[PDB]
Coordinates of C-alpha atoms and ligand atoms in Angstrom, one line a residue:
Chain A
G1 CA 54.6 97.6 120.8
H2 CA 57.7 95.6 119.8
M3 CA 59.4 98.2 117.7
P4 CA 61.9 100.1 119.9
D5 CA 62.1 103.3 117.8
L6 CA 58.3 104.1 117.4
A7 CA 56.3 106.6 119.8
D8 CA 53.5 105.5 122.0
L9 CA 50.8 107.9 120.9
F10 CA 48.1 106.6 123.3
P11 CA 49.5 107.3 126.7
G12 CA 48.0 105.0 129.3
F13 CA 46.2 102.7 126.8
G14 CA 46.9 99.0 127.1
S15 CA 47.4 96.8 124.3
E16 CA 46.3 93.5 123.0
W17 CA 47.4 91.0 120.2
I18 CA 44.2 89.2 119.7
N19 CA 44.2 85.8 118.1
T20 CA 41.8 85.0 115.3
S21 CA 41.6 82.2 112.6
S22 CA 43.2 84.6 110.1
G23 CA 45.9 85.9 112.4
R24 CA 46.5 88.3 115.1
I25 CA 44.9 91.7 115.4
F26 CA 46.9 94.3 117.3
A27 CA 45.0 96.9 119.2
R28 CA 45.4 99.6 121.8
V29 CA 42.7 99.6 124.4
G30 CA 41.7 102.3 126.7
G31 CA 38.8 103.8 128.6
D32 CA 35.7 102.2 130.2
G33 CA 32.1 102.1 129.3
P34 CA 30.3 100.8 126.2
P35 CA 32.7 99.2 123.7
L36 CA 33.7 101.1 120.6
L37 CA 36.0 99.7 117.9
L38 CA 38.0 102.2 115.8
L39 CA 39.3 101.1 112.3
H40 CA 41.9 103.1 110.3
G41 CA 42.5 103.1 106.6
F42 CA 45.2 103.6 103.9
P43 CA 48.1 104.3 104.1
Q44 CA 47.8 104.5 107.8
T45 CA 47.7 102.3 111.0
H46 CA 45.7 102.5 114.3
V47 CA 47.8 105.4 115.3
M48 CA 45.7 107.8 113.1
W49 CA 43.2 107.8 116.0
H50 CA 45.7 109.2 118.5
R51 CA 44.1 112.7 118.6
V52 CA 40.5 111.4 119.0
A53 CA 40.8 108.1 121.0
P54 CA 41.7 109.7 124.3
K55 CA 38.6 111.9 124.2
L56 CA 36.5 109.0 123.3
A57 CA 38.1 107.0 126.2
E58 CA 36.5 109.4 128.6
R59 CA 33.1 107.9 127.6
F60 CA 33.7 104.4 126.0
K61 CA 35.9 101.4 126.2
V62 CA 37.9 102.1 123.1
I63 CA 39.6 99.4 121.0
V64 CA 41.9 100.9 118.4
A65 CA 42.8 98.0 116.0
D66 CA 45.2 97.6 113.1
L67 CA 43.3 96.1 110.2
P68 CA 44.1 92.6 109.0
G69 CA 47.4 92.8 107.3
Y70 CA 48.1 96.4 108.4
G71 CA 50.4 97.9 111.1
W72 CA 51.3 95.1 113.6
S73 CA 48.4 92.8 112.7
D74 CA 49.5 89.5 111.0
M75 CA 49.5 89.3 107.2
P76 CA 47.6 86.2 106.1
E77 CA 48.6 84.9 102.7
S78 CA 46.3 86.1 100.0
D79 CA 44.7 84.1 97.1
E80 CA 43.5 84.7 93.6
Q81 CA 40.3 86.4 94.9
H82 CA 42.2 88.5 97.4
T83 CA 40.0 86.9 100.0
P84 CA 41.6 87.9 103.3
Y85 CA 41.7 91.5 102.2
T86 CA 38.2 91.7 101.1
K87 CA 36.0 93.8 103.4
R88 CA 33.8 90.8 104.0
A89 CA 36.7 88.7 105.3
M90 CA 38.2 91.6 107.3
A91 CA 34.9 92.2 109.0
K92 CA 34.6 88.5 109.9
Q93 CA 38.1 88.6 111.3
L94 CA 37.4 91.6 113.4
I95 CA 34.2 90.1 114.7
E96 CA 36.2 87.1 115.9
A97 CA 38.7 89.5 117.5
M98 CA 36.0 91.4 119.3
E99 CA 34.6 88.0 120.6
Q100 CA 37.9 87.3 122.1
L101 CA 37.4 90.4 124.2
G102 CA 33.8 89.4 125.0
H103 CA 32.2 92.0 122.7
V104 CA 29.4 90.5 120.6
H105 CA 27.5 93.8 120.2
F106 CA 29.5 97.0 119.9
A107 CA 29.8 100.4 118.4
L108 CA 32.0 100.9 115.4
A109 CA 33.7 103.9 113.7
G110 CA 35.8 103.4 110.6
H111 CA 37.9 105.7 108.4
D112 CA 38.7 105.1 104.8
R113 CA 39.5 101.3 104.2
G114 CA 38.3 100.7 107.8
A115 CA 35.0 102.5 107.1
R116 CA 34.7 100.0 104.1
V117 CA 35.2 97.1 106.5
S118 CA 32.6 98.8 108.8
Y119 CA 29.7 99.2 106.4
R120 CA 30.4 95.7 105.0
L121 CA 30.2 94.4 108.6
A122 CA 26.9 96.2 109.0
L123 CA 25.5 94.6 105.8
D124 CA 26.7 91.1 106.5
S125 CA 26.2 91.0 110.3
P126 CA 24.1 93.9 111.5
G127 CA 23.4 92.2 114.9
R128 CA 27.0 92.9 115.9
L129 CA 26.5 96.6 115.8
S130 CA 24.7 99.0 118.1
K131 CA 25.6 102.0 115.9
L132 CA 28.0 102.7 113.1
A133 CA 30.1 105.7 111.9
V134 CA 31.8 105.9 108.5
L135 CA 34.4 108.6 107.9
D136 CA 35.6 109.9 104.6
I137 CA 33.9 107.4 102.3
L138 CA 31.2 106.4 100.0
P139 CA 30.5 102.7 99.4
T140 CA 33.0 101.1 97.0
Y141 CA 30.2 100.5 94.5
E142 CA 29.5 104.2 94.4
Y143 CA 33.1 105.1 93.7
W144 CA 33.2 102.7 90.7
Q145 CA 29.7 103.8 89.4
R146 CA 31.3 107.4 89.3
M147 CA 33.9 106.4 87.1
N148 CA 34.5 108.6 84.1
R149 CA 37.4 110.6 82.8
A150 CA 37.3 113.3 85.4
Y151 CA 37.1 110.8 88.3
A152 CA 39.8 108.5 86.8
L153 CA 42.2 111.4 86.7
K154 CA 41.2 113.0 90.0
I155 CA 41.3 109.7 92.0
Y156 CA 43.8 107.4 90.1
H157 CA 45.1 105.1 92.7
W158 CA 42.1 102.8 92.8
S159 CA 42.9 101.5 89.4
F160 CA 46.6 101.6 89.7
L161 CA 46.9 99.7 93.0
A162 CA 44.4 97.1 91.7
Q163 CA 46.7 96.2 88.7
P164 CA 47.8 92.5 88.9
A165 CA 50.8 91.8 91.0
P166 CA 53.7 92.5 90.8
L167 CA 53.1 95.8 88.9
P168 CA 52.2 98.2 91.7
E169 CA 54.5 96.4 94.2
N170 CA 57.5 96.9 91.9
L171 CA 56.7 100.5 91.2
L172 CA 56.1 101.2 94.9
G173 CA 59.3 99.4 96.0
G174 CA 61.8 101.7 94.5
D175 CA 61.2 104.7 96.8
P176 CA 58.4 103.8 99.1
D177 CA 59.0 106.8 101.4
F178 CA 58.3 109.3 98.7
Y179 CA 55.1 107.6 97.6
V180 CA 53.5 107.3 101.1
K181 CA 54.5 110.8 102.1
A182 CA 53.2 112.4 98.9
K183 CA 49.9 110.5 99.4
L184 CA 49.5 111.6 103.0
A185 CA 50.1 115.2 102.0
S186 CA 48.0 115.2 98.8
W187 CA 44.8 114.1 100.5
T188 CA 45.0 116.7 103.3
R189 CA 43.2 120.0 103.1
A190 CA 46.3 122.0 102.7
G191 CA 48.3 119.6 100.6
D192 CA 51.2 119.2 103.0
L193 CA 52.1 117.1 106.1
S194 CA 51.3 119.8 108.7
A195 CA 48.0 118.2 109.8
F196 CA 49.9 115.1 111.1
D197 CA 52.0 114.6 114.1
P198 CA 55.5 113.7 112.8
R199 CA 55.6 110.7 115.2
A200 CA 52.5 109.4 113.5
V201 CA 53.9 109.9 110.1
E202 CA 56.9 107.8 111.2
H203 CA 54.5 104.9 112.1
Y204 CA 52.9 105.2 108.6
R205 CA 56.3 105.4 106.9
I206 CA 57.7 102.4 108.7
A207 CA 54.8 100.3 107.8
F208 CA 54.9 101.4 104.2
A209 CA 58.6 100.5 104.1
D210 CA 57.9 96.8 104.5
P211 CA 57.2 95.1 101.1
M212 CA 54.8 92.6 102.7
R213 CA 52.8 95.5 104.1
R214 CA 52.7 97.2 100.7
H215 CA 51.5 93.9 99.2
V216 CA 48.6 93.8 101.6
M217 CA 47.7 97.3 100.6
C218 CA 47.6 96.3 97.0
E219 CA 45.6 93.2 97.8
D220 CA 43.1 95.5 99.7
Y221 CA 42.8 97.6 96.6
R222 CA 42.5 94.5 94.3
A223 CA 39.6 93.4 96.5
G224 CA 38.2 96.9 96.2
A225 CA 38.1 96.6 92.4
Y226 CA 36.8 93.0 92.3
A227 CA 35.1 91.1 95.2
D228 CA 34.3 94.1 97.3
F229 CA 32.6 95.8 94.3
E230 CA 30.8 92.6 93.5
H231 CA 29.6 92.2 97.1
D232 CA 28.4 95.8 97.2
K233 CA 26.7 95.5 93.8
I234 CA 24.7 92.5 95.1
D235 CA 23.4 94.6 98.1
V236 CA 22.5 97.7 96.1
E237 CA 20.8 95.8 93.4
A238 CA 18.8 93.8 96.0
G239 CA 17.8 97.0 97.8
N240 CA 19.5 95.9 101.0
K241 CA 20.0 98.8 103.4
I242 CA 21.9 98.9 106.7
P243 CA 19.3 99.1 109.5
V244 CA 21.9 100.0 112.1
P245 CA 21.8 103.7 113.2
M246 CA 24.5 105.3 111.2
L247 CA 26.6 108.5 111.1
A248 CA 28.5 109.6 107.9
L249 CA 31.2 112.2 108.4
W250 CA 33.4 113.5 105.5
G251 CA 36.0 116.1 104.9
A252 CA 34.6 118.9 102.7
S253 CA 37.8 118.6 100.5
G254 CA 38.0 114.8 100.8
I255 CA 37.6 112.0 98.2
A256 CA 34.0 111.1 99.1
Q257 CA 32.5 114.4 98.2
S258 CA 34.6 114.6 94.9
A259 CA 31.5 114.1 92.8
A260 CA 28.8 113.2 95.2
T261 CA 26.4 114.6 97.9
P262 CA 27.5 112.0 100.5
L263 CA 24.5 112.0 102.7
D264 CA 22.2 111.4 99.8
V265 CA 24.4 108.5 98.7
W266 CA 24.3 107.0 102.2
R267 CA 20.5 107.3 102.4
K268 CA 20.4 104.8 99.5
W269 CA 22.4 102.3 101.6
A270 CA 21.1 102.9 105.1
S271 CA 17.7 103.3 106.6
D272 CA 18.6 105.4 109.6
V273 CA 21.5 107.7 108.7
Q274 CA 22.7 111.2 109.7
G275 CA 25.7 113.0 108.7
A276 CA 27.6 116.1 108.0
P277 CA 30.7 117.6 106.4
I278 CA 33.7 118.9 108.4
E279 CA 36.2 121.3 106.9
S280 CA 39.1 118.9 106.3
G281 CA 40.7 116.8 103.6
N282 CA 40.6 113.0 103.7
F283 CA 42.1 112.5 107.2
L284 CA 39.3 113.8 109.5
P285 CA 40.6 112.4 112.8
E286 CA 44.0 114.1 112.4
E287 CA 42.9 117.2 110.5
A288 CA 39.8 118.0 112.6
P289 CA 40.3 116.0 115.8
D290 CA 38.1 118.0 118.2
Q291 CA 35.2 118.2 115.8
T292 CA 35.5 114.5 114.9
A293 CA 35.7 113.5 118.5
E294 CA 32.7 115.5 119.4
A295 CA 30.6 114.3 116.6
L296 CA 31.4 110.7 117.5
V297 CA 30.8 111.1 121.2
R298 CA 27.5 112.8 120.6
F299 CA 26.4 110.1 118.1
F300 CA 27.5 107.1 120.1
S301 CA 26.2 108.4 123.4
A302 CA 22.8 109.3 122.2
Chain B
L1 CA 72.0 98.6 69.3
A2 CA 71.3 96.5 66.1
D3 CA 70.4 97.8 62.7
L4 CA 67.1 96.3 61.8
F5 CA 66.5 98.1 58.5
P6 CA 68.5 96.6 55.7
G7 CA 68.6 99.0 52.8
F8 CA 67.6 102.0 54.8
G9 CA 69.6 105.1 55.5
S10 CA 69.6 107.2 58.8
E11 CA 68.6 110.9 58.6
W12 CA 68.3 113.7 61.3
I13 CA 65.7 116.1 60.0
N14 CA 65.7 119.7 61.3
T15 CA 62.5 121.5 62.4
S16 CA 61.7 124.5 64.5
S17 CA 61.1 122.3 67.6
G18 CA 64.1 120.1 67.2
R19 CA 65.5 117.2 65.1
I20 CA 63.5 114.2 64.0
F21 CA 65.4 111.0 63.6
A22 CA 64.3 108.7 60.8
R23 CA 65.3 105.6 58.8
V24 CA 64.6 106.2 55.1
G25 CA 64.5 103.6 52.4
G26 CA 62.8 102.7 49.1
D27 CA 61.6 104.8 46.3
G28 CA 58.3 105.7 44.9
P29 CA 55.4 107.5 46.7
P30 CA 56.3 108.7 50.2
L31 CA 55.0 106.9 53.2
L32 CA 55.7 108.0 56.8
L33 CA 55.5 105.4 59.6
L34 CA 55.0 106.6 63.2
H35 CA 55.5 104.4 66.3
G36 CA 54.0 104.7 69.8
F37 CA 54.5 103.9 73.4
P38 CA 56.8 102.5 74.9
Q39 CA 58.6 101.9 71.5
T40 CA 60.6 103.8 68.9
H41 CA 60.9 103.7 65.1
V42 CA 62.3 100.2 65.4
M43 CA 59.0 98.7 65.9
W44 CA 58.4 98.9 62.1
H45 CA 61.4 96.7 61.3
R46 CA 59.4 93.6 60.2
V47 CA 57.0 95.6 57.9
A48 CA 59.0 98.5 56.6
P49 CA 61.2 96.5 54.2
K50 CA 58.1 95.1 52.5
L51 CA 56.7 98.6 52.2
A52 CA 59.9 99.9 50.7
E53 CA 59.3 97.5 47.8
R54 CA 56.8 100.0 46.6
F55 CA 57.3 103.3 48.6
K56 CA 59.8 105.7 49.8
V57 CA 59.4 104.8 53.5
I58 CA 60.3 107.3 56.3
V59 CA 60.4 105.6 59.7
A60 CA 60.5 108.4 62.2
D61 CA 60.9 108.7 66.0
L62 CA 58.1 110.8 67.4
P63 CA 59.0 114.2 68.9
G64 CA 60.8 113.5 72.2
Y65 CA 61.0 109.7 71.5
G66 CA 63.9 107.6 70.5
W67 CA 66.7 109.7 69.0
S68 CA 64.5 112.7 68.1
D69 CA 65.2 115.8 70.1
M70 CA 63.1 116.6 73.2
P71 CA 61.5 120.1 73.0
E72 CA 60.9 121.7 76.4
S73 CA 57.3 121.2 77.6
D74 CA 55.1 123.6 79.4
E75 CA 52.1 123.6 81.7
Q76 CA 49.7 122.5 78.9
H77 CA 52.1 119.8 77.7
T78 CA 52.0 121.7 74.3
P79 CA 55.0 120.0 72.3
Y80 CA 53.6 116.6 73.2
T81 CA 50.1 117.2 72.2
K82 CA 49.2 115.3 69.0
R83 CA 48.4 118.6 67.3
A84 CA 51.9 119.9 68.0
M85 CA 53.6 116.6 67.2
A86 CA 51.7 116.5 63.9
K87 CA 52.8 120.1 63.1
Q88 CA 56.4 119.2 63.8
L89 CA 56.3 116.1 61.6
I90 CA 54.7 118.1 58.8
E91 CA 57.7 120.4 59.0
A92 CA 60.1 117.5 59.0
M93 CA 58.4 116.1 55.9
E94 CA 58.6 119.5 54.2
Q95 CA 62.4 119.4 54.8
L96 CA 62.4 116.3 52.5
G97 CA 60.0 118.0 50.0
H98 CA 57.0 115.9 51.0
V99 CA 53.9 117.9 51.2
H100 CA 51.4 115.2 50.3
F101 CA 52.2 111.7 51.6
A102 CA 50.8 108.4 52.9
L103 CA 50.9 107.9 56.7
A104 CA 50.6 104.9 59.0
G105 CA 50.7 105.1 62.7
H106 CA 50.6 102.8 65.6
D107 CA 49.5 103.6 69.2
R108 CA 50.6 107.2 70.1
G109 CA 51.8 107.6 66.5
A110 CA 48.4 106.7 65.2
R111 CA 47.0 109.4 67.5
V112 CA 49.4 111.9 65.9
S113 CA 48.2 110.6 62.5
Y114 CA 44.5 111.0 62.9
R115 CA 45.0 114.4 64.5
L116 CA 47.2 115.3 61.5
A117 CA 44.4 114.2 59.2
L118 CA 41.8 116.3 61.1
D119 CA 43.9 119.4 61.2
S120 CA 45.7 119.2 57.8
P121 CA 44.0 116.6 55.5
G122 CA 45.6 118.1 52.4
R123 CA 48.9 116.7 53.6
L124 CA 47.7 113.1 53.3
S125 CA 46.9 110.8 50.4
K126 CA 45.9 107.9 52.6
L127 CA 45.9 107.1 56.3
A128 CA 46.3 103.9 58.3
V129 CA 45.8 103.7 62.0
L130 CA 46.9 100.6 63.9
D131 CA 45.6 99.5 67.3
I132 CA 43.7 102.6 68.3
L133 CA 40.4 104.4 68.7
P134 CA 40.3 108.2 69.0
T135 CA 41.4 109.6 72.4
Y136 CA 38.0 111.0 72.9
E137 CA 36.4 107.6 72.5
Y138 CA 38.6 106.0 75.2
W139 CA 37.8 108.7 77.6
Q140 CA 34.1 108.4 76.9
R141 CA 34.4 104.7 77.7
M142 CA 36.4 105.2 80.9
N143 CA 34.1 103.2 83.4
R144 CA 35.3 100.8 86.0
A145 CA 36.2 98.1 83.5
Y146 CA 38.1 100.4 81.3
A147 CA 39.8 102.2 84.1
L148 CA 41.2 98.9 85.3
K149 CA 42.2 97.8 81.7
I150 CA 43.9 101.0 80.7
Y151 CA 44.9 102.4 84.1
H152 CA 48.0 103.9 82.6
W153 CA 46.0 106.6 80.8
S154 CA 45.2 108.1 84.2
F155 CA 48.5 107.0 86.1
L156 CA 50.9 108.4 83.6
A157 CA 48.8 111.6 83.3
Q158 CA 49.1 112.3 87.1
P159 CA 51.0 115.6 87.8
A160 CA 54.7 115.3 87.8
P161 CA 56.8 114.0 89.6
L162 CA 54.5 111.1 90.6
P163 CA 54.8 108.8 87.6
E164 CA 58.3 109.9 86.9
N165 CA 59.4 109.0 90.5
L166 CA 57.8 105.6 90.4
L167 CA 59.1 104.7 87.0
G168 CA 62.7 105.5 87.9
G169 CA 62.9 102.7 90.4
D170 CA 63.0 99.9 87.9
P171 CA 62.3 101.2 84.5
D172 CA 63.4 98.0 82.7
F173 CA 60.7 96.1 84.6
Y174 CA 58.0 98.5 83.7
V175 CA 58.8 98.8 80.0
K176 CA 59.2 95.1 79.7
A177 CA 56.0 94.5 81.6
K178 CA 54.1 96.8 79.3
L179 CA 55.5 95.3 76.2
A180 CA 54.7 91.8 77.4
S181 CA 51.3 92.4 78.9
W182 CA 49.9 94.0 75.7
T183 CA 50.9 91.1 73.5
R184 CA 48.7 88.0 72.8
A185 CA 51.4 85.8 74.3
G186 CA 51.9 87.8 77.5
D187 CA 55.6 87.6 77.3
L188 CA 58.4 89.1 75.2
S189 CA 58.5 86.3 72.7
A190 CA 56.8 88.2 69.9
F191 CA 59.6 90.8 69.8
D192 CA 63.0 90.6 68.3
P193 CA 65.3 90.8 71.3
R194 CA 67.3 93.4 69.5
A195 CA 64.1 95.6 69.2
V196 CA 63.4 95.0 72.9
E197 CA 66.8 96.4 73.7
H198 CA 66.2 99.6 71.7
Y199 CA 63.0 100.1 73.7
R200 CA 64.7 99.3 77.0
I201 CA 67.6 101.7 76.3
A202 CA 65.1 104.6 75.5
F203 CA 63.1 104.0 78.6
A204 CA 66.2 103.8 80.7
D205 CA 66.6 107.6 80.3
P206 CA 64.7 109.8 82.8
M207 CA 64.2 112.6 80.3
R208 CA 62.7 110.1 77.8
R209 CA 60.3 108.8 80.4
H210 CA 59.3 112.4 81.3
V211 CA 58.3 112.9 77.6
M212 CA 56.2 109.8 77.7
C213 CA 54.4 111.1 80.7
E214 CA 53.9 114.5 79.0
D215 CA 52.4 112.6 76.0
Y216 CA 49.9 111.0 78.4
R217 CA 49.2 114.3 80.2
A218 CA 48.3 115.8 76.8
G219 CA 46.3 112.7 76.1
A220 CA 44.2 113.4 79.2
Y221 CA 43.8 117.1 78.6
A222 CA 44.5 119.1 75.4
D223 CA 44.3 116.1 73.1
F224 CA 40.9 115.2 74.5
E225 CA 39.7 118.8 74.2
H226 CA 40.9 118.9 70.6
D227 CA 39.0 115.7 69.8
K228 CA 35.9 117.0 71.6
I229 CA 35.8 120.0 69.3
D230 CA 35.8 117.8 66.2
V231 CA 33.1 115.6 67.6
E232 CA 30.9 118.6 68.5
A233 CA 31.5 120.1 65.0
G234 CA 30.7 116.7 63.4
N235 CA 34.1 116.8 61.6
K236 CA 35.1 113.6 59.8
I237 CA 38.4 112.8 58.2
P238 CA 37.9 112.8 54.4
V239 CA 41.2 111.0 53.7
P240 CA 40.8 107.3 52.6
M241 CA 41.6 105.4 55.8
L242 CA 42.4 101.9 57.0
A243 CA 41.9 100.8 60.6
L244 CA 43.6 97.7 61.7
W245 CA 43.6 96.3 65.2
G246 CA 44.6 93.3 67.1
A247 CA 41.6 91.0 67.9
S248 CA 43.1 90.8 71.5
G249 CA 44.2 94.4 71.7
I250 CA 43.1 97.5 73.5
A251 CA 41.0 99.2 70.8
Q252 CA 38.5 96.3 70.6
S253 CA 38.2 95.8 74.3
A254 CA 35.3 98.2 75.0
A255 CA 34.2 99.1 71.5
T256 CA 33.6 97.9 67.8
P257 CA 36.5 99.6 66.1
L258 CA 35.1 100.1 62.6
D259 CA 31.9 101.4 64.0
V260 CA 33.8 103.9 66.0
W261 CA 36.0 105.0 63.1
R262 CA 33.0 105.4 60.8
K263 CA 31.9 108.2 63.1
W264 CA 35.2 109.9 62.6
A265 CA 36.0 109.2 58.9
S266 CA 33.9 109.2 55.7
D267 CA 35.9 106.6 53.9
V268 CA 37.2 103.9 56.2
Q269 CA 37.9 100.2 55.8
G270 CA 39.4 97.9 58.3
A271 CA 39.9 94.6 59.8
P272 CA 40.9 92.8 62.9
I273 CA 44.0 90.7 62.9
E274 CA 44.7 87.9 65.4
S275 CA 47.3 89.7 67.5
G276 CA 47.6 91.7 70.6
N277 CA 48.3 95.4 70.5
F278 CA 51.7 95.3 68.6
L279 CA 50.4 94.4 65.1
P280 CA 53.6 95.1 63.2
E281 CA 55.7 92.8 65.4
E282 CA 53.1 90.2 66.4
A283 CA 51.5 89.9 63.0
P284 CA 54.0 91.3 60.5
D285 CA 52.9 89.5 57.4
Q286 CA 49.3 90.2 57.7
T287 CA 49.9 93.8 58.7
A288 CA 52.3 94.4 55.8
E289 CA 50.1 92.7 53.3
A290 CA 47.1 94.9 54.4
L291 CA 49.2 98.1 54.3
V292 CA 50.7 97.4 50.9
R293 CA 47.3 96.6 49.4
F294 CA 45.8 99.7 51.0
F295 CA 48.5 102.2 50.0
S296 CA 49.1 100.9 46.5
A297 CA 45.4 101.5 45.6
Ligands
CA1 CA1 31.2 106.4 131.7
CA2 CA1 35.8 93.1 71.6
CL3 CL1 35.0 85.8 103.4
CL4 CL1 34.8 107.2 98.4
CL5 CL1 38.8 120.2 115.1
CL6 CL1 47.7 104.8 72.8

């Protein structure tokens, strides 16, 4: 990396800044074997995979990428439809990045926003994927269809971060550290920062400290309220299901299971899906790294 | 801060929960006016003088708002529940010898007002609610579209200190943005700049912001539960009522307001007025005219 103060949490992994038509994608790359792309979510960066990626690199060529606009990836300028931060566009961008590495058919695991990229990739371009894992999510459509008083109060940030700019940007800009740290803690099982490595927390904090990075996060959530929802609605209403073998993992105290039975939801969206809970909040790869690594290795190796 | 109420006096009214500030003017039958968020009693300045042609007009700051005192809240947000606020205002009115009065409210003050009417109908001769539906009805309509439109119902209701921390960064931005965004114009041009300054100065105080978040927490929890009991009981307000709303406001966004109010009140009339959510400032003549006609009657 180019930031002198931040830890290297993937000892021995290389790196890559991969050009695409929407901007560079930063990734750490390690291991050997079949290619496996790992995609983080909010308010994190690729480093969230640091306690799973080395175990996966014993079996796979692991590509640990910052999402478009996140971490050290470039931040394309957005537009009125939030286009570069839609899951459709991110998926296209990451497909281009993987081609740069010679990977036209690969395995994919995503967490949170990255899981949203991942299932959208599978809907739009299933030929790209051998197998898919989604961690800690339901489809975006399913979150919004669950909207009611209880869900609006229990899971407020979808609507808040989606408000027109500059509302969330101004609110987040006064004390960004307090907001990101409280979010990271709130969504864990225990409600504190103990599940995270402090060095990883520093990566998350430093990213969140940049106004441009916060803007991207809000654009991601705007897309999540608008285009992403629309795209998902088209698929569900058409009865399109992902044909790619799929794994759904979620924390037992996470967001996805708030008011759903996640495997039943996924079966509506995918024709060959398996899945299981793990005792954890919303940050499976950090909260439950050994169980998450095992479940992924077993799924992708089968 | 400017005086926007020619002919009105300034009163601190004692209650068991603290002082209520009011401007008081006119003579005749008593009429209480209750503001909402993120405003103070000043919001009535374009309509109150017309009302005071005919009525003794009491323009009060809600409990914890403006210059009223701030009772200490608790884990159930009790002093900022509409039921509690209504009780406190009933006490304040009793200090003036008013036990049967007319009432008009706007936004959170309208919520106080219909709750007052449900709990203590004998206190009211007539009731006007501006720019609202019942709390229960908003929550029953809280789908994706509505969650995006009225996000602040869930944001401000998050457990402390989340909203308070965010709002303290640039409170002037946020208050001004709320004021502007909820108007037809989408800017501050509908407001007297002197009024805007009252609202800005109130919102600049952290303790005042905390009250506003407690108000919204009650709105999410106890107020909802109180309303749900009345809906389950089939209780309707028997007090003659007027519902006015902005054609571009929040109340009409996901519902037909008079249809809704007819489910809650047995004697309701009403009308849209071309305006955003701030009827008394965006559309002062039409609002005053409707109120005078209604309350004279
Ligand atoms: Ca091997
Ligand atoms: Ca309408
Ligand atoms: Cl696109
Ligand atoms: Cl979800
Ligand atoms: Cl584990
Ligand atoms: Cl309101």
